[PDB]
């Protein structure tokens, strides 16, 4: 009954690696001793309940702290000047100077300035006082309590769901699309139309009077009569001021498009109409699959009979239903890939089409949110590929996938890997070559020789969307175009002015720097996909190790025989692709941050001139914008950014410490620990105190994991202070 | 209720052996501390009446107690708070010496360790402890709901 | 308020120290006979 009760081998392990491996295999429930599928699924269900409880506790904590210690009520009156407060600081290490510097935001105590946009979100959805935030926090706390009770309950004997119920795909998909997506989005549209539009128009609608107050003067009579245009009639005027009745309309569902002029955010009526329409579409979608009545579809039948003629895709999608519904790793990988794509989409769309009031002028929050969601998108994509590899090495059955669409991937994996290698090499060679050419040309005082390629195709797409400065005059940019004529009466009158207005991040102007950095991003994405795809496809075996599936997913090596077999397990292909994930998201965030900093400063010529060469990138972005951060504290004093400076150097330290684990490997440290063991055992007094687990150096995979974690954490903790502190100090 | 004790023990089989949990030793020790705490809040009440505790609007400074003074924060620590906290620190130090130190004399804390048992329930001190702890929970209940403070409630009720 | 002073040390020094002690003792517990 040692600590790794789930692993008898680790329990009998006498060294200190028992603790490490137990901790890191605690959640690998599939490989646990004496584990069954039904128990696995039930334990997963309970852990999901606990996780949801944690999420709602985190949200309730944010709300409570803003309500109690934040200046939400003061910020509501003057959103564009008052700095939002996250929470108070309690630190007995602070000096008087630190307390004075951190006293800010119109409060009498030290505080932290929120950079998450929660103030903007809550103000937009219609929170006006600390009481509303407190009651929301209480509701979320009660929800977390209920979820924890549910997680406890569903592990009970009489309340333990069965494996057939878990594997009921059709009912789950029907409900999680018609209710979880559809009805929830309908509920959000109802919340907007009942509470948010009235609050933006100067009406205090709360639980005590939402029953009495009508969302529309007409009521539901237009809805039941079919005269649904009455709800679009009388939209908000361009002279409207958010939160006040002056210039306010009566429409609840509109398609104006563009942006609200005062807040430079999308119309709440447009957002409500969006959610209503998409809820209708989701509710219709959720009746597809057969559940207990007769109508519907069978996913097994669909997949089985989807096979093209003459065996183009082999046997088609036969057996994919079985593999997907049997293997949880494939489902996890698909979910992670979809969620990573969605996270990239929200990151790309929040800045281009801001939805929350006054967020466009809050430059720190925009950069923080973009960097945050892009990093999480990268993490989710790497996880999706890693779990695909785990599925291949653990849950793939060639007998079931005899000549399947999935098996043909393994059939021509060599071609796939070689072509990924080719495209990666081409992009890298030519992007780096053009960059170095531009560097040398500017270095020799002759910038005229630069190879500057205009992103003609992206500019063409901008023109097709409605941009006019390029002069392409295609589709929506052409006044005569049939597309413009068709859309002229619904959304184009707002969209055209929004896109052509130069004060906005919607379809930013692009140039040779954008061309070059986009091709660098393509290089990085293709190389990350190369590493991950090769890991997934060679996880089962390789010419250097055809029996890799017997060893499994994460093993150290096969020894120095056959020339050396370092980093062969396809867990090491996660490890090696995490570096490229950090690289590509770093390039993306550098690009976003610099192109937005220059535009906020009204100095886009600096980006357009200096972004074409790496010296310009190093000088005008990092070196230039690093001054307010490093000057957070100096010999003469300290500012509110001293915390950010400390963290920049702390992330630097963690990143550098990761290199130790990544470079120096286990034998050196094992011999050193043997010497230390000798010294401890031979010294007097101290030899009375004796360990229980024999100290040993960290395992190979353990130290790869630790070094990668140090690398990643130093990466994020040294870039976040930069992107926040420089943006705060410049305020542009 | 013994069924609930068995359910606990069962669940938490480790904390159980030292007496930590729903145990008679734990109930006795709290009861002792609760009786001492009724005595303590009465002592502070009469001390505040007789202006015993250095008190008033006087507050600490960063130059005398540093970051624990919290000077510049919203919290306004008073010298009466400081001196009562010092008294409680002395109480905690003596208690820690009595607990982790020799069982010089008196009674243990961890069920006398040594695999002793918990003697299920003068020996009326456990009843008094029930009284004292129910009084204390009632006092917090009124201080939270009625919002009528603590020393004021004690004074008006007595 | 005084809740920060009361709670931050309680939850960041006393509780994590007790948690580390409990985890260490539990992982060092040997097999039952």
């Amino acid at each position: 009954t040692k600590f790794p009760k789930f692993s008898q081998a680790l329990a009998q392990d006498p060294a200190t690696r028992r603790i490490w491996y137990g901790i890191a295999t605690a959640h690998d429930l599939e490989s646990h001793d004496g584990m069954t599928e039904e128990n696995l699924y039930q334990k997963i269900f309970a852990s999901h309940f606990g996780h949801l409880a944690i999420i709602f506790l985190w949200t309730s904590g944010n709300l409570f702290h803003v309500a109690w210690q934040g200046n939400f009520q003061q910020w509501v009156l003057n959103p564009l000047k008052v700095k939002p407060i996250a929470h108070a600081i309690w630190d007995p290490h602070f000096g008087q100077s630190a307390i004075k510097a951190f006293t800010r935001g119109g409060v009498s105590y030290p505080v932290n300035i929120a950079t998450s946009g929660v103030y903007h979100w809550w103000y937009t959805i219609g929170m006006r006082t600390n009481e509303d935030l407190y009651f929301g926090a209480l509701g979320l706390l009660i929800l977390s309590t209920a979820l924890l009770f549910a997680g406890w309950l569903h592990l009970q004997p009489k309340f333990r769901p069965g494996i057939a119920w878990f594997k009921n795909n059709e009912s789950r998909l029907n409900h999680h699309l018609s209710g979880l997506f559809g009805v929830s989005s309908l509920a959000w549209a109802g919340h907007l139309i009942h509470v948010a539009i009235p609050e933006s128009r100067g009406q205090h609608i709360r639980w005590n009077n939402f029953t009495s107050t009508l969302p529309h003067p007409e009521g539901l009579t237009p809805f039941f009569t079919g005269n649904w245009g009455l709800y679009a009639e009388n939209p908000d005027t361009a002279q409207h001021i958010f939160g006040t009745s002056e210039g306010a309309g009566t429409a609840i569902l509109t398609f104006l498009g563009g942006f609200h002029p005062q807040t430079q955010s999308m119309w709440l009526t447009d957002i409500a109409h969006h959610h209503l329409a998409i809820a209708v579409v989701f509710i219709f979608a959720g009746h597809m699959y057969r559940t207990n009545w007769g109508i519907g579809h069978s996913m097994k039948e669909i997949l089985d009979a989807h096979v093209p003629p003459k065996g183009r895709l082999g046997s088609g999608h036969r057996g994919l239903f079985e593999t997907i519904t049997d293997s949880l790793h494939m489902q996890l990988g698909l979910a992670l890939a979809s969620l990573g794509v969605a996270t990239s989409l929200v990151a790309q769309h929040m800045y281009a089409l801001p939805s929350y009031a006054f967020m466009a002028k809050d430059y720190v929050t925009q950069a923080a949110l973009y960097t945050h969601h892009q990093y999480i998108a990268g993490f989710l994509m790497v996880g999706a590929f890693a779990h695909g590899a785990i599925f291949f090495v653990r849950d793939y059955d060639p007998e079931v996938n005899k000549d399947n669409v999935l098996a043909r991937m393994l059939q021509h994996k060599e071609a796939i890997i070689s072509h990924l290698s080719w495209v990666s090499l081409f992009l890298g060679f030519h992007t780096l070559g053009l960059y170095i050419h531009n560097d040398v040309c500017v270095a020799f005082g002759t910038p005229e020789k630069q190879i500057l390629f205009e992103p003609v195709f992206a500019q063409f797409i901008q023109a097709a969307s409605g941009k006019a400065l390029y002069g392409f005059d295609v589709l929506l940019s052409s006044p005569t175009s049939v597309a413009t004529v068709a859309g002229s009466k619904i959304w184009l009158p707002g969209w055209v002015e929004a896109i052509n207005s130069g004060k906005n991040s919607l379809f930013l102007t692009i140039g040779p720097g954008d061309f070059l950095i986009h091709h660098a991003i393509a290089l990085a994405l293709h190389t990350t996909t190369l590493i991950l795809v090769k890991g997934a496809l060679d996880a089962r075996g390789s010419k250097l190790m055809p029996d890799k599936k017997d060893f499994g997913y994460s093993f150290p090596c096969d020894g120095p025989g056959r020339g050396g077999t370092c980093d062969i397990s396809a867990w090491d292909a996660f490890y090696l692709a995490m570096f490229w994930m950090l690289n590509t998201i770093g390039w993306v965030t550098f690009y976003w941050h610099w192109k937005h900093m220059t535009i906020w400063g009204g100095n886009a010529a600096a980006f357009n001139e200096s972004s074409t060469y790496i010296m310009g990138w190093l000088r005008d972005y990092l070196w230039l914008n690093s001054s307010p951060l490093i000057n957070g504290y100096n010999a003469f004093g300290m500012n509110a950014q001293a915390v950010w400076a400390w963290m920049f150097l702390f992330g630097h330290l963690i990143w550098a410490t990761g290199f130790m684990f990544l470079i120096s490997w286990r034998g050196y440290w094992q011999e050193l620990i043997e010497t230390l063991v000798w010294a401890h055992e031979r010294t007097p007094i101290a030899n009375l105190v004796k360990w229980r687990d024999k100290p040993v150096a960290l395992s190979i995979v353990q130290a790869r994991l630790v070094g990668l974690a140090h690398f990643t954490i130093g990466y994020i903790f040294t870039y976040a202070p930069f992107v926040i502190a420089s943006t705060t100090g410049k305020f542009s | 209720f013994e069924a609930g004790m068995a359910q606990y023990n069962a669940d938490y089989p480790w904390l159980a052996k030292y007496g930590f949990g729903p145990s008679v030793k734990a109930e006795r020790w709290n009861g002792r501390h609760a009786m001492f705490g009724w005595v303590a809040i009465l002592a502070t009440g009469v001390a505040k009446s007789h202006g015993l505790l250095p008190a008033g609007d006087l507050m600490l400074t960063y130059q005398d107690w540093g970051g624990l003074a919290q000077q510049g924060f919203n919290t306004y620590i008073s010298n009466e708070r400081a001196v009562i906290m010092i008294a409680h620190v002395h109480a905690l130090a003596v208690s820690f010496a009595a607990a982790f130190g020799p069982q010089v004399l008196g009674d243990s804390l961890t069920l006398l360790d040594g695999e002793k048992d918990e003697e299920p329930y003068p020996a009326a001190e456990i009843a008094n402890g029930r009284m004292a702890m129910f009084g204390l929970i009632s006092l917090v209940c009124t201080s939270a709901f009625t919002g009528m403070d603590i020393l004021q409630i004690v004074d008006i009720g007595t | 308020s005084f809740l920060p002073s009361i709670l931050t040390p309680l939850v960041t020094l006393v509780f994590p120290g007790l948690c580390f002690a409990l985890f260490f003792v539990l992982i060092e517990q040997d097999e039952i006979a």
Binding site: A67, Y134, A137, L138, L141, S144, G151 | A144 | -
Partner: peptide, 30 residues
């Protein structure tokens, strides 16, 4: 302005959540 009583009832609900979390953790362990 959030009141001390409001913070206290929120803390009580948090303690209830703590007890339920401990129970859920025990049931997951077994």
């Amino acid at each position: 302005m959030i009141t001390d009583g409001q913070i206290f009832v929120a803390l009580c609900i948090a303690l209830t959540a703590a007890i339920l979390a401990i129970g859920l953790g025990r049931q997951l362990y077994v």
